[PDB]
Design a protein around this ligand. Structure first.
Ligand SMILES: Nc1ncnc2c1ncn2[C@@H]1O[C@H](COP(=O)(O)OP(=O)(O)OP(O)(O)=S)[C@@H](O)[C@H]1O
Ligand SMILES: Nc1ncnc2c1ncn2[C@@H]1O[C@H](COP(=O)(O)OP(=O)(O)OP(O)(O)=S)[C@@H](O)[C@H]1O
Ligand SMILES: Nc1ncnc2c1ncn2[C@@H]1O[C@H](COP(=O)(O)OP(=O)(O)O)[C@@H](O)[C@H]1O
Ligand SMILES: Nc1ncnc2c1ncn2[C@@H]1O[C@H](COP(=O)(O)OP(=O)(O)O)[C@@H](O)[C@H]1O
Ligand SMILES: Nc1ncnc2c1ncn2[C@@H]1O[C@H](COP(=O)(O)OP(=O)(O)O)[C@@H](O)[C@H]1O
Ligand SMILES: [Mg+2]
Ligand SMILES: [Mg+2]
Ligand SMILES: [Mg+2]
Lengths: 11, 579, 577, 189
């Protein structure tokens, strides 16, 4: 469906 | 690439069983696979018929080289639907992975994708909210033609989703798969026999394989012939070696196989045996000790059954069509229960009283809900389908409309029934029994006159007028009863007391009843008009009422030692408990 | 990364398996097959599905198993380490590959994975590189490797049925709850492990009564888990004494009260004081519900025969009916019977189920249904409460289709469900009511002298109802009309509700016995019974007072006096401020 | 709520199934029981075994406030778990346990708090208290059979009217001071 994903940047 | 397995490569290392029969189906697949367009074949077959096996047969034929040169270099792959779907978390992952494989496959020409149970991904959902979106990636492949996709479906699924959607059905041909004949089935087992005997070093006699296929179809009505048959042989091989730890016997017999099917059938081993000779002779005697009284009926009924089950008679006509007449509420119905218990068949008590209305007749020859479920089926049609070898106990036949009788004529002569659902049932092995209660009603009917006139009617007279002679012509035999005996009714008290006393044994209670009291109680309960119908109720009423009060707290809790005897003046039983 | 089950059994950590010999033989049957050799242990949770796997390995060391499998050494997958240990990708592939080499080359070697449905997809966080189940499929099709799985009855149909190919490899083996005799050995075997932690010694009598009382009341879980829970709770309760382990031994009294707390039931219920309650409750019915004394004897003896054991085990406790006029206490007796016995009262209205489609919804769908709609509300009620009172009023109004289901349930004492395998109706008492018994024509007859067309003795209902359904009934109870004195007592009940309403308004109402007789004769009706009593009460008592309370003598409260005069034949109203 | 409290203390003390689950309906008072358990401990009206215990409450919003970088949620949650096992006497009362089922993993890693805590619960070193509704428990919590096996369901029901009036009288001083009013015993009934 239409799902929002929150990315994580590398430290 | 890892998702789908290469069947053709598997054949080289083994694991492919030889294909026995179905050469015409195989030729059709080769013929349709060579087409420029619409080459994609479909295997519309029921579960267990072996539709998947023919797909592997094509891989064996190609590696062997007994196929056209154009297809000689072709490869086949079996898509693993469960692998891709299990790994996915949400929709879109499966489509992406499937897109990657398809592109890799299109690079190499002469690649065939065997999508077993294609209906699952194509549509109809109802698994995890549905996976109908997989059809999106299937339509381009069909239209593109770059690769040929073999499909496996079923008659029900095919019409539901495939025939309705022209996009798929137009680019998919049909290869109807039908269960093989009994003769073809034994040949299939013979081809597969070397694998099993070499597995654990045991021999399989020709007698057992023939027995395995006939017994399974006769008893296992919920599975198809080819698949369930292998389980019987495989179960026998395991059971034969593991159970007799002391003695290792390689030779197998037909009797050994009976025990194998008994476990899954969950029916006594003796009844499971297919011995028409032994069962016919003992069936009559078996009904005597189990049911006592009116033994003349058992003699006539059993000999008549022998005539039809002899095998010479064409079995298009139902095995049994005995139309019982005369009094009701007698052992006539009890005989059917024990007859069904000895054989092990499931007795179906169909009562026409509920179907008296003309509209209600359609329930027997049509879906009762009249909905679009498309799986309910007719009451009579589905019931025969569930138990093709079970007797139908017709009840209250008198309250039946003419159309109800018309349906009976078809089964007696045609031996088949057609309903709105369209499913065909087999009446070759089915038995039919009826009961006429009209005679009982006339006996109690009053006479409009100054003095009542005795009417000692006979069972024969009612059927002549109430039933058309056409039914009697097709009827095989009619039995009659008058009354069991005066003594047997006294014995009926004893038989019930046996089961009632068995109940006391569980409670650790002992009870005795006077011989004279037993006789009087039997007469009080037994009636000519009602027969033995109220006898059951009176038996419990005599002792259940008084015993109930004191069983909670009293001597009955420990041993009982009850004494029961009537009083001459009061004609009332007396209860005394001595622990 | 790996675990061993044969080594653990050899050491003796796992206790001796008790019972389930048939499952062991049927389990090894498919295990030795050339194909379809993956025995799938399908059972509800907490029914020892894993214990069977561990039990089989234990018997192998003892040697009381077929020699064919005795040489084998069963293994167990490390669910925890594989699921979370190998967070980084790549390590799982090389580590799992090592298991394949160990798994192969030894046909005797076996592997058991509990909760086999959970591993349908695994081995990667988000990548589709590999699937543990799929990796073993090439070696499974051949049959060289055989494994044992564990899936719940619900999970079996949810996923395994989808992939016929995977389902084809496996073969279902039904697991039935162990009997009380089997459980007492299992719990006794596990008794030392827990006794040390709690420093208590459970008496033999205490541990056998626990299962009896637990199944009698606790119904959420099966006997193995249920029995273990009551033993662990009782032990913890003992060491929580006020000063220092006041009670060391675990007597029956301790477990008798533990189940009460867990079951949210009042004390003295576990005491099994059923004999005395039956005698005293009888008198309560007459005072609470006036009349129908003859039916009370039938209702009370019915319960005594079932509990005493004068019935077939399969047959339910009771299948009766109440044919009588309206408002004759038919429903009233049922409510008191439940409260009197401390049993749940589940009532269903057949009027809503008059249509054919509604009857199917009662049990979901006989042909089948999908979409997790939870259809079959009647079946679900029994699973949550096995012992209950099922009241089906106006059964005659219901379509005859519903009767067909009762014939099957009455015959075996169990009702099948669309998803649920079966239900327990043995403890439930089937009680219904019907109003067809009272059927009198509005027009008496075509004649100067009316004819007393006395109601038949159940002859009319016999043609309306099916014959077999009538015979299967344990007994038939009829409810007749109520005597005039009873009606004089019923008005007292209606009057009492008025006084409580007046208490909030500070109004005193006093009515004479003679006035009550006027409402009684006009109130009670043969055709309607108690139904018109309200209208006269409202019209003759509530309506006149409404005017005064809103605007009149009783605005701020006062006393009400009522009297009847023969001159006018109507009641008289008097108000005192 | 004397009986309901007993069940929780008993569940915490037993060897296995140490984690209790207070199932109920909205507003029944399931959260007050857990918050009230700590109040009972400081008051000292509890068994000696539980007197030394220290109940903790986790706020998921604060936990997810700064988890921008990779591994932030894992290091935080894992760090907190270490504190619980070393003490061996603390209890983490987390309300709305169903929320953590899919929280802490945006995508790719799929390292959810439920998966992280699961192994520790198997051993039994850490005991926690949960709260959930019937609908939420069946729709979400029941799906995770692993977590459900560790937790022991507890059925809560609204108290009787008789019990409710006592609750109001006990809580009456708190609301009387805030509003500067005196509630009559007849009014509460
Ligand atoms: N027949 C049995 N033989 C031996 N131990 C048993 C038996 N039945 C129950 N137990 C004990 O009680 C437990 C029952 O649950 P398990 O067998 O562990 O798991 P399961 O019930 O198969 O599945 P779950 O509920 O998903 S852990 C066993 O692990 C033993 O401790
Ligand atoms: N035994 C009690 N003692 C004191 N206050 C109580 C008690 N039971 C209920 N309450 C009050 O009722 C409120 C609601 O109950 P809670 O357990 O806090 O609800 P909740 O579980 O947070 O509700 P949700 O979010 O709707 S599931 C409490 O916060 C108290 O104000
Ligand atoms: N024509 C056939 N030739 C050889 N074996 C067959 C044939 N038909 C069925 N079988 C056997 O039936 C079993 C199952 O075949 P399969 O194709 O997997 O069935 P299904 O298509 O129902 O899944 C195997 O033992 C297979 O060898
Ligand atoms: N010859 C017989 N041997 C054994 N039982 C008999 C015999 N005749 C009658 N009975 C018993 O008497 C009853 C016959 O009527 P029944 O079948 O109860 O009537 P209905 O089918 O109308 O309920 C049954 O209990 C049946 O077992
Ligand atoms: N013996 C009785 N004892 C107490 N109330 C009775 C009795 N007989 C009739 N009633 C009254 O009859 C009324 C029946 O109401 P209800 O159950 O709604 O009727 P119905 O079942 O006809 O729909 C109630 O006011 C009930 O108290
Ligand atoms: Mg388990
Ligand atoms: Mg009523
Ligand atoms: Mg809260």
């Amino acid at each position: 469906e239409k799902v929002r994903d929150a990315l994580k940047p590398p430290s | 690439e890892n998702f789908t397995t290469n069947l053709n490569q598997l054949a080289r290392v083994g694991g492919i069983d030889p294909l026995i029969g179905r050469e015409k189906e195989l030729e059709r697949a080769i013929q349709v696979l060579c087409r420029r367009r619409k080459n994609n074949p479909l295997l519309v077959g029921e579960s267990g018929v072996g539709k998947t096996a023919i797909a592997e047969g094509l891989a064996w034929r190609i590696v062997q080289g007994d196929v056209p040169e154009v297809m000689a270099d072709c490869t086949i792959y079996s898509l693993d639907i469960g692998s891709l779907l299990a790994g996915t978390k949400y929709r879109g992952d499966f489509e992406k992975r499937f897109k990657a494989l398809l592109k890799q496959l299109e690079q190499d020409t002469n690649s065939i994708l065997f999508i077993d149970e294609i209906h699952t991904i194509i549509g109809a959902g109802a698994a995890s909210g549905g996976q109908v979106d997989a059809a999106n990636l299937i339509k381009p492949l069909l239209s593109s033609g770059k690769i040929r996709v073999i499909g496996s479906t079923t008659y029900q699924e095919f019409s539901n989703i495939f025939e309705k959607d022209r996009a798929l059905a137009r680019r998919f041909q049909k290869i109807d798969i039908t269960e093989p004949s009994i003769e073809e089935t034994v040949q299939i087992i013979n081809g597969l026999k070397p694998k099993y005997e070499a597995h654990h070093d045991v021999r399989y006699t020709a007698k057992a394989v023939r027995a395995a296929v006939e017994l399974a179809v006769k008893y296992i009505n919920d599975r198809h012939l080819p698949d369930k048959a292998i389980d019987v042989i495989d179960e026998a091989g395991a059971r034969a070696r593991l159970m007799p730890v002391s003695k290792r016997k390689k030779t197998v017999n037909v009797a050994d196989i009976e025990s194998v099917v008994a476990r899954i059938a969950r029916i006594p081993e003796k009844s499971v045996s297919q011995s028409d000779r032994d069962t016919l002779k003992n069936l009559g005697d078996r009904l005597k000790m189990l049911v006592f009284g009116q033994d003349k009926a058992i003699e006539a009924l059993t000999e008549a059954i022998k005539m039809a089950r002899a095998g010479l008679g064409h079995e298009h006509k139902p095995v049994g069509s005995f139309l019982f007449a005369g009094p009701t509420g007698v052992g006539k119905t009890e005989v059917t229960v024990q007859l069904s218990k000895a054989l092990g068949i499931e007795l179906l008590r169909f009562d026409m009283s509920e179907y008296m209305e003309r509209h209600t007749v359609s329930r027997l020859i049509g879906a009762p809900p009249g909905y679009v479920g498309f799986d309910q089926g007719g009451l009579l049609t589905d019931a025969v389908i569930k138990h093709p070898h079970a007797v139908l106990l017709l009840d209250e036949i008198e309250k039946a409309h003419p159309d109800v009788f018309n349906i009976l004529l078809q089964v007696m002569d045609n031996g088949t029934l057609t309903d709105n659902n369209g499913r065909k049932a087999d009446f070759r092995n089915v038995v039919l029994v009826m009961t006429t209660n009209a005679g009982v009603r006339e006996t109690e009917r009053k006479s409009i006159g100054l003095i009542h006139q005795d009417n000692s009617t006979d069972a024969m007279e009612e059927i002549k007028k109430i039933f058309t002679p056409e039914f009697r012509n097709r009827l095989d035999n009619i039995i009659w009863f008058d009354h069991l005996s005066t003594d047997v009714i006294h014995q009926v008290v004893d038989k019930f007391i046996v089961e009632l006393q068995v109940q006391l044994d569980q409670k650790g209670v002992s009870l005795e009843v006077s011989q004279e009291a037993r006789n009087w109680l039997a007469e009080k309960g037994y009636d000519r008009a009602m027969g033995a119908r109220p006898m059951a109720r009176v038996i419990q009423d005599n002792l259940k009422k008084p015993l109930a009060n004191e069983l909670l707290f009293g001597s009955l809790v420990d041993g009982g030692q009850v004494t029961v005897a009537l009083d001459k003046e009061k004609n009332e039983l007396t209860y005394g408990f001595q622990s």
